[PDB]
């Protein structure tokens, strides 16, 4: 999975 660190982003995506 991916973890997104920034504004407006879904925090975790798979």
């Amino acid at each position, epitope marked *: *999975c*991916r*973890i*997104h*660190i*920034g*504004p*407006g*982003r879904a925090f975790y995506t798979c």
Partner: antibody
Amino acid sequence: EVQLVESGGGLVKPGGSLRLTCVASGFTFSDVWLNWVRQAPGKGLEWVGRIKSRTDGGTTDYAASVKGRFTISRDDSKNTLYLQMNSLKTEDTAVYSCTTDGFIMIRGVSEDYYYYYMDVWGKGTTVTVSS
Amino acid sequence: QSVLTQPPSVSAAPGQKVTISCSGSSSNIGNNYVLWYQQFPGTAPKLLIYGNNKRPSGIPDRFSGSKSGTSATLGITGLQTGDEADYFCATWDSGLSADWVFGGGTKLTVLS
């Protein structure tokens, strides 16, 4: 050139409208989220709003100070970002710049991490609102 | 009245070290991650630190960052005359609109 170039700035009276354009060169424009920011004289940078990429829905978010007055849109075919400003106020006077979000990727064993930041920055265009 | 608060200026001589602080609230710095940028007059901002304390490619280890509570700090050691510039912090807000937010900037003078 790998760059963002804004145009359309000028003098407008309060209550009036103005559209800014921002043209991208040298990278895949459709892949990036874009922001508008502004900086008033003697003040610090303020974020105005964003528009996401088409793959992420193309939606827009706005600062509370401009909500309902400003609209951001994008035309991927023309590598162009727009800021439509309506009901302008004297306090909207500022240099307006566009930026892209970029990221730093860090691979992990089970998750990859993406850290976002404002990456490519335009030089700005000046908007003056005065009666 | 910038969202994040920085000292207007800091200074030290070549070879010395300085810190530049960034003060916010739980809705920004407290719960999110801090970036630092360097900006010379008439140039674009350049990223120095992301994720509170990480350095991107090409940034030397004499630049460092920390975060504590609702504050953050940029540290610069072995000052060079070429480091004289404005330095500003950034993060984002925890509301649904997720604004990017910025410090007012700090002018670093390398005393000459």
